Design a protein around this ligand. Structure first.
Ligand SMILES: CC[C@]1(O)C[C@@H]2CN(CCc3c([nH]c4ccccc34)[C@@](C(=O)OC)(c3cc4c(cc3OC)N(C)[C@H]3[C@@](O)(C(=O)OC)[C@H](OC(C)=O)[C@]5(CC)C=CCN6CC[C@]43[C@@H]65)C2)C1
Ligand SMILES: CC[C@]1(O)C[C@@H]2CN(CCc3c([nH]c4ccccc34)[C@@](C(=O)OC)(c3cc4c(cc3OC)N(C)[C@H]3[C@@](O)(C(=O)OC)[C@H](OC(C)=O)[C@]5(CC)C=CCN6CC[C@]43[C@@H]65)C2)C1
Ligand SMILES: Nc1ncnc2c1ncn2[C@@H]1O[C@H](COP(=O)(O)OP(=O)(O)OP(=O)(O)O)[C@@H](O)[C@H]1O
Ligand SMILES: Nc1ncnc2c1ncn2[C@@H]1O[C@H](COP(=O)(O)OP(=O)(O)OP(=O)(O)O)[C@@H](O)[C@H]1O
Ligand SMILES: [Mg+2]
Ligand SMILES: [Mg+2]
Length: 1156
């Protein structure tokens, strides 16, 4: 995959013209430097002695080359970006077409989300990897070679030494980049412990809040943050040392080159202009190669990904849903013959589900299926639709094999109502019309009437226009089934397969659905897989599938007389803003560091005007007319000075780095600490919201250093360095004349913006496109995750056309952005050449009257222009400021958060002793996530000291909500709750959490030692190993722990992978019992555990029941039998209360549950 461009045979003209334009543009700059050297030489010759004519001629040369540069740059960038846009459009369209056309098995194998992220990331990477980067690389190569050519043709010795020095700097920069990358990877690795701890704690937020173990997790995260801080400080020091060494090497090379050139010219060789042009061209060539480092790498970054994408296009599917070569029968009579159907799913090919079966079905035969859970009746259903292919068998209709007919046409005549129908997020009318494009409003009404969906469909607003919510959120359990049935019927299917037709909420609509389905069956063959036998009785025939083969056959009476498995089954069943002054939170911790950093930044910035002054003096050495030998010595004084400056730079930068990094890491630590603390000292409701997801929160806490540290330190560093450099240059220039200084000030801004934009053109080329790509994202994703239904009804054509339109809508935007980027880049490039021309023409005109010496004019020009270029480059170098500012605003918002239930708060009551007598009255509460769904209906409970209460009812009554409110996770909307006649709100939060104990319905265990895991139940006190052993004996886990290796030292794995689920539940129960809470709550303690284990847990609870109020929420009525009191929930309202014997005497809802 070295040449992965294949589209728009006429687009290659764009690529070729762009390549030529890039070559000529890169070659131009060395020509500009050559004419600059010639102009300097002629100016020096004039100074030694009509200069106006020569100055005008060279100004015209500058103007012509600048116009050529503008045209070439526009052609290059515009054409290359045009080609990139066209290629990316074609690639995305083809890739989506291939994905939709792919076979079902291939999708079932690979993760669908993986495929979606592959699509988006790979296409974005390819977009970044061609067009702009290719043009930049060709420009860099052309500049390299042309500069070397200019140096050689106008130099024989100085060019050689410059070229030989160049690889030293190149290798130094390469090794610096390599070490920086490796150490950045190491630093990333250094956050593994912190990331894991944060993820585990956030996932266990509920349990940790219940146990009040914030301090230990915070300390662990603090240790991890300290390690990461050391790593980051080392990283920053290394990077700053590398940059300083690069600058030192550059200045050493410049000093050596200028010294050698001065010696050579003093020997009588080529004059100063030749030295200047040769040196500048050599440096341009030697440093242009570095500009190519991203492009090629980006190409590689865009290379491998492309490979993978192409593979997906390459694979021709076994079942081409888009192919039309398949035969198309004219009249399709209802008749099915599946003989020796043997097959298995390639996802797990080891297990063979289909082992050959015989099934002959006539027209309009409601052949029901009977078997066991997982017997493979849904495999027979799937194989019926021709999605897969039998390993060895024959499925035919009307004597013709399934493969003998076109897949699309064959699937069109066959409708399937899956167990979990999915409706696309379109209009209900569009949902119905998905069956066939040629569907009229009258047909839609007829289908609605047949499905008996007229009431539900028309009652809501927009009867034929309502947009179905994501995954039918607005729809109902039976509404989706009715809509699917109507859509299936809209296609006039010949074979209708059904699976779990109305197994969603009840059978009220099931009767209507069955009546509608059975209304028309003469021509439309039917197959049904219904768990309920109600419709089985009316079934024309019933086939019993077992061991991958049909066993039972015949009518219901025949099956009953045959003593089949079906007979036994029937018998049994019957945008906050930001602020800088406010964001100055590092001053307290960096009062003496920021000052040194600013001082070093000022010195580094002033280094540039020092270079300008030194270079101007060096040129003036020969610009002078005295021409003594002393100049040689003077030249040395200048030449050596160069080296000195470099050394100073190498110091300051290093001294800067250790400062800046030290300023950063500290904050990076503190924030990472503080934010995490602020995360724990918050209410659960804050964690209960779409915004706060564990992944989002942990990423925000993880990728925050680079933003806050950037915006704080780097902003000040770059601002100080830039003000130093540019202001010093401006003042020094104004000292040496002002008119030329005024013109150069006028032309500085274009230079600065050009530098900034060109620097940004490498990395941040593609950052705003996604905001439009999402317009198709959903459309693609909706067709990937929910692809089974789409392939079922053959609706890929509409999805691909919609994808085409959604790509077209931003395609014009992409074209326009390409054009504007090209135009602005070309104008930016031409700006420098125009500035050179105008400024030097003005300087020549001024010096003609002896107003200012040529040396002064050159000094001002160099100072101001080089300062503009330096500010552009350095401003581009620093991290982006907007993203950093918004991230810092988010961090400030998080850290400043004030909760409704603050654990850290010391305001509250801390009673010495309590009887644990709970009294809740008129308890009203709603979940802040969905306040429009109240769960509490004014409960009334009064549990006395040493009293056991149990909660029963139907799922969804909020049983777990009672426990949640007991721990004071959520404040009550209304009602009074008192533990021994004391207001809950007035009571302390930490004391309440410690004194009480709970057992999670879904217990989780951290990746800690068994002893440590058990001890984590309690906090703020050292638990002796003897206490842990006694508690384990309480839960009957001491012997189990001893049996396993390491005893309690056995490091429990993540979620206790090694340990059994029942073992994890027992460990959680033991941890809860360690604190010996007065009030203990177990929500489905049994749940999934050994019956003997549940009995042992109940016995252990009873042993400590005395003086320990207990609450139990479990489905095992046997445990509730001995419960002191039982309360049955009725939609959040308690119906009956009292002892179990009283409940038995007072028959009611519980009576049915006990019998059930
Ligand atoms: C004329 C073109 C060029 O000279 C090319 C680079 C950038 N500038 C000139 C000055 C310069 C360079 N580096 C600077 C750092 C701070 C301030 C200025 C510079 C330049 C260099 O060292 O002079 C020879 C350079 C730059 C980079 C550079 C190497 C380099 O020296 C050749 N790296 C290749 C990239 C880089 O992003 C990368 O991915 O390395 C693979 C790299 O990151 C790493 C991993 O170190 C790095 C640090 C050197 C990171 C942040 C900024 N990016 C920009 C590109 C990259 C650099 C050379 C213009
Ligand atoms: C249209 C915007 C712009 O292209 C921006 C820069 C300036 N001009 C274009 C011409 C240009 C650039 N460089 C030239 C060298 C010789 C002749 C012409 C140029 C430009 C570039 O490299 O594009 C390929 C550039 C120039 C520099 C430049 C960056 C730059 O863009 C890559 N640097 C800011 C300085 C520089 O001296 C410096 O950073 O250290 C002091 C820098 O040295 C380094 C470290 O690369 C360098 C270029 C190698 C060296 C010697 C002379 N100084 C003066 C300014 C500085 C340059 C690009 C206009
Ligand atoms: N598309 C599929 N990909 C992979 N495995 C599948 C697929 N469909 C079914 N299976 C698995 O193959 C076996 C066959 O069971 P299948 O799902 O076909 O039964 P069923 O008739 O739907 O019964 P039930 O719904 O009562 O479990 C099961 O283990 C099932 O999980
Ligand atoms: N964090 C939450 N976000 C959204 N809804 C929630 C949240 N916590 C609870 N709910 C809602 O509260 C109810 C959950 O009931 P709860 O589990 O408290 O009682 P239950 O009778 O023990 O439950 P189940 O019958 O499901 O075992 C559901 O309505 C659920 O939507
Ligand atoms: Mg099934
Ligand atoms: Mg529950």
């Amino acid at each position: 995959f070295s040449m992965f461009r294949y589209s728009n045979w006429l687009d290659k003209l764009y690529m070729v013209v762009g390549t030529l334009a890039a070559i000529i543009h890169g070659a131009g700059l060395p020509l500009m430097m050559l004419v600059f050297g010639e102009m300097t030489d002629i100016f020096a010759n004039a100074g030694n002695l009509n200069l106006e004519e020569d100055m005008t001629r060279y100004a015209y040369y500058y103007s012509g080359i600048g116009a050529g540069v503008l045209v070439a740059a526009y052609i290059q960038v515009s054409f290359w970006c045009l080609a990139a846009g066209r290629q990316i459009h074609k690639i995305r369209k083809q890739f989506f077409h291939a994905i939709m056309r792919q076979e079902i098995g291939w999708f079932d194998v690979h993760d669908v989300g993986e495929l979606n992220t592959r699509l988006t990331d790979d296409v974005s990477k390819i977009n970044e990897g061609i067009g702009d980067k290719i043009g930049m690389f060709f420009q860099s190569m052309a500049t390299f070679f042309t500069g070397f050519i200019v140096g050689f043709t106008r130099g024989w010795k100085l060019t050689l030494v410059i070229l030989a020095i160049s690889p030293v700097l190149g290798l130094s920069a390469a090794v610096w980049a390599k070490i920086l990358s490796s150490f950045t990877d190491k630093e990333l690795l250094a956050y593994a412990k912190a990331g894991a701890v944060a993820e585990e704690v956030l996932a266990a937020i509920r349990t940790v809040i219940a146990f009040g173990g914030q301090k230990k997790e915070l300390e662990r995260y603090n240790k991890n943050l300290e390690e990461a801080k050391r790593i980051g400080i080392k990283k920053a020091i290394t990077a700053n040392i590398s940059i300083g060494a690069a600058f030192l090497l550059i200045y050493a090379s410049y000093a050596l080159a200028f010294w050698y050139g001065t010696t050579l010219v003093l020997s009588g060789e080529y004059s100063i202009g030749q030295v200047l042009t040769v040196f500048f061209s050599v440096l341009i060539g030697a440093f242009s190669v570095g500009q190519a480092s991203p492009s090629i790498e980006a190409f590689a970054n865009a290379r491998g990904a492309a490979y993978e994408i192409f593979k997906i296009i390459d694979n021709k599917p076994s079942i081409d849903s888009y192919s039309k070569s398949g035969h198309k029968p004219d009249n399709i009579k209802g008749n099915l013959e599946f003989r020796n159907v043997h097959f298995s799913y390639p996802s797990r090919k080891e297990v063979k589900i289909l082992k050959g079966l015989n099934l002959k079905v006539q027209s309009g035969q409601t052949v029901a299926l009977v078997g066991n859970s997982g017997c493979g009746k849904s495999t027979t259903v799937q194989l019926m639709q021709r999605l897969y292919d039998p390993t060895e068998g024959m499925v035919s209709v009307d004597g013709q094999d399934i493969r003998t007919i076109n897949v699309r046409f064959l699937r069109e005549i066959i409708g399937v109502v899956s167990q979990e129908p999915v409706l696309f997020a379109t209009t209900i009318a569009e949902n119905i019309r998905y069956g066939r494009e040629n569907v009229t409003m009258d047909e839609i009404e007829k289908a609605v009437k047949e499905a008996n969906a007229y009431d539900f469909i028309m009652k809501l607003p927009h009867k034929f226009d309502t947009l179905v919510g994501e995954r039918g959120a607005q729809l109902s359990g039976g509404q989706k089934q009715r809509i699917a049935i109507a859509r299936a019927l809209v296609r006039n299917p010949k074979i209708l397969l059904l699976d779990e037709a109305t197994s969603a909420l009840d059978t009220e609509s099931e009767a209507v659905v069955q009546v509608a389905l059975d209304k028309a069956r003469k021509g439309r063959t039917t197959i049904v897989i219904a768990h309920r036998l109600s419709t089985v009785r009316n079934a024309d025939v019933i086939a019993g599938f077992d061991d991958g083969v049909i066993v039972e056959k015949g009518n219901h009476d025949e099956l009953m007389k045959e003593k089949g498995i079906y007979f036994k089954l029937v018998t049994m069943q019957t945008i906050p803003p930001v602020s800088f002054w406010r964001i100055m939170k590092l001053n307290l911790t960096e009062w003496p560091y920021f000052v040194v950093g600013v001082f070093c930044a000022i010195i580094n910035g002033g280094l540039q005007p020092a270079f300008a002054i030194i270079f101007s003096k060096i040129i003036g050495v020969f610009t002078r007319i005295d021409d003594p030998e002393t100049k040689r010595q003077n030249s040395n004084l200048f030449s050596l000075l160069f080296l000195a400056l470099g050394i100073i730079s190498f110091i300051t930068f290093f001294l800067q780095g250790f400062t800046f990094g030290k300023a950063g890491e500290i904050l990076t630590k503190r924030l990472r600490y503080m934010v995490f603390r602020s995360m724990l000292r918050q209410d659960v409701s804050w964690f209960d919201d779409p915004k706060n997801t564990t992944g989002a929160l942990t990423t925000r806490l993880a990728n925050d250093a680079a933003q806050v540290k950037g915006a704080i330190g780097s902003r000040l560093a770059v601002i100080t360095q830039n003000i130093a450099n540019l202001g010093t240059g401006i003042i020094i220039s104004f000292i040496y004349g002002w008119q030329l200084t005024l013109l150069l000030l006028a032309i500085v801004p274009i230079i600065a913006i050009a530098g900034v934009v060109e620097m940004k053109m490498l990395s941040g080329q593609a950052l705003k496109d996604k905001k439009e790509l999402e317009g198709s994202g959903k459309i693609a994703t909706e067709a990937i995750e929910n692809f089974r239904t789409v392939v079922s009804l053959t609706q890929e054509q509409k999805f691909e056309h919609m994808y085409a339109q959604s790509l077209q809508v931003p395609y014009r935007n992409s074209l326009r952005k390409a054009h504007i980027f090209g135009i602005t880049f070309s104008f930016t490039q031409a700006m420098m050449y125009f500035s050179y021309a105008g400024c030097f023409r003005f300087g020549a005109y001024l010096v003609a009257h002896k107003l200012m010496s040529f040396e002064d004019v050159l000094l001002v020009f160099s100072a101001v222009v080089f300062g503009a270029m330096a500010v552009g480059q350095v401003s581009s170098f620093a991290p982006d400021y907007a993203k950093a500012k918004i991230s810092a605003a988010h961090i400030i918002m998080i850290i400043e958060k004030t909760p409704l239930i603050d654990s850290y708060s010391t305001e509250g009551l801390m009673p010495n002793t309590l009887e644990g007598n709970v009294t809740f009255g008129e308890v009203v509460f709603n979940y802040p996530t969905r306040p429009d769904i109240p769960v509490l209906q004014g409960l009334s409970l009064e549990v006395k000291k040493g009293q056991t209460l149990a909660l029963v009812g139907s799922s969804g009554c909020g049983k777990s909500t009672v426990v949640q409110l007991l721990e004071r996770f959520y404040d009550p909307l209304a009602g009074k709750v008192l533990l021994d006649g004391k207001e809950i709100k007035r009571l302390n939060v930490q004391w309440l959490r410690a004194h009480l104990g709970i057992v999670s319905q879904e217990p989780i265990l951290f990746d800690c030692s068994i002893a440590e895991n058990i001890a984590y139940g309690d906090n703020s006190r050292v638990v002796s190993q003897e206490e842990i052993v006694r508690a384990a004996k309480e839960a009957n886990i001491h012997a189990f722990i001893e049996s396993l290796p390491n005893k309690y030292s056995t490091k429990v794995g993540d979620k206790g992978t090694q340990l059994s689920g029942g073992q994890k539940q027992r460990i959680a129960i033991a941890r809860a019992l360690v604190r010996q809470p007065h009030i203990l709550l177990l929500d489905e303690a049994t749940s999934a555990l050994d019956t003997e284990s549940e009995k042992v847990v109940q016995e252990a609870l009873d042993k400590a029941r005395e003086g320990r109020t207990c609450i139990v929420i479990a489905h095992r009525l046997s445990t509730i039998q001995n419960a002191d009191l039982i309360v049955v929930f009725q939609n959040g309202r308690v119906k009956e209360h009292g002892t179990h014997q009283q409940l038995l005497a007072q028959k009611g809802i519980y009576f049915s549950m006990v019998s059930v």
